[PDB]
Amino acid sequence: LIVPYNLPLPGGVVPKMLITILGTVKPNANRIALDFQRGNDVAFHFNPRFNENNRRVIVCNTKLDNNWGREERQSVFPFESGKPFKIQVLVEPDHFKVAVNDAHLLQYNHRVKKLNEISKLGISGDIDLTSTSYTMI
Ligand SMILES: OC[C@H]1O[C@@H](O[C@H]2[C@H](O)[C@@H](O)[C@@H](O)O[C@@H]2CO)[C@H](O)[C@@H](O)[C@H]1O
């Protein structure tokens, strides 16, 4: 699986949908990013950063055409350079729930409300990708 990886969501996203990504962070990793795209927009951007002025952070946000909105920043950061990881996204009616290695990490309230239009996930950054899977209910 070559990264940047596009994972089609031809059904769009639906409540109860579960996306599971398995991989390994490369050595000396700078960033990871998951990008749920709807048309000209990024409905949900999940962006671990290994070094922003000597703190790890995960930045979350939504892009509407060329403009990023209000940043949500979170410090819980389970990833490590060289190490295997599992990221699970569960879609709920009012938010995306994100768990990393079987422990809950954050939730991100939908800003793009037409879930069925979110037709792709992009997986990029400093990772080897092993598998993807989702469940479309
Ligand atoms: O909000 C997610 C996007 O952030 C962008 O960088 C922001 C940066 O985090 C903030 O501190 C300030 O400098 O504005 C930057 C430009 O919007 C990234 O460029 C983009 O890729 C997203 O991760």
Side-chain angles (χ1 to χ4, degrees), residues 1 7 10 22 28 49 69 77 89 93 95 97-98 104 123:
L1 301 194
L7 170 67
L22 292 190
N28 307 122
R49 307 170 178 179
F77 194 96
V89 182
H95 60 272
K97 209 159 313 228
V98 176
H104 176 64
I123 305 168

Side-chain angles (χ1 to χ4, degrees), residues 20-133:
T20 306
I21 312 269
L22 292 190
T24 300
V25 186
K26 297 191 302 187
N28 307 122
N30 181 61
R31 57 184 309 273
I32 297 170
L34 305 199
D35 284 291
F36 285 98
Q37 296 144 91
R38 187 268 309 268
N40 302 321
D41 307 330
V42 175
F44 173 36
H45 172 80
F46 173 90
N47 177 201
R49 307 170 178 179
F50 288 81
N51 194 319
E52 175 172 281
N53 295 130
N54 286 144
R55 300 190 43 189
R56 296 210 296 182
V57 65
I58 307 183
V59 179
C60 300
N61 203 358
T62 299
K63 201 178 179 197
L64 298 177
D65 202 8
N66 297 292
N67 305 295
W68 288 108
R70 170 185 55 88
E71 296 193 295
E72 303 174 29
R73 280 157 182 261
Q74 146 76 293
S75 297
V76 177
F77 194 96
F79 304 102
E80 302 285 349
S81 294
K83 289 182 70 237
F85 70 75
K86 167 170 89 165
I87 305 162
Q88 301 166 296
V89 182
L90 184 66
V91 185
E92 304 262 43
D94 296 330
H95 60 272
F96 291 95
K97 209 159 313 228
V98 176
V100 166
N101 314 329
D102 299 302
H104 176 64
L105 185 74
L106 55 76
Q107 42 173 70
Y108 182 77
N109 291 344
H110 303 307
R111 303 178 196 178
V112 151
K113 303 300 188 33
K114 304 177 178 192
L115 308 184
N116 67 300
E117 278 180 0
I118 303 177
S119 62
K120 295 177 171 203
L121 168 53
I123 305 168
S124 67
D126 302 321
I127 58 153
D128 296 320
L129 200 56
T130 289
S131 52
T132 72
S133 90

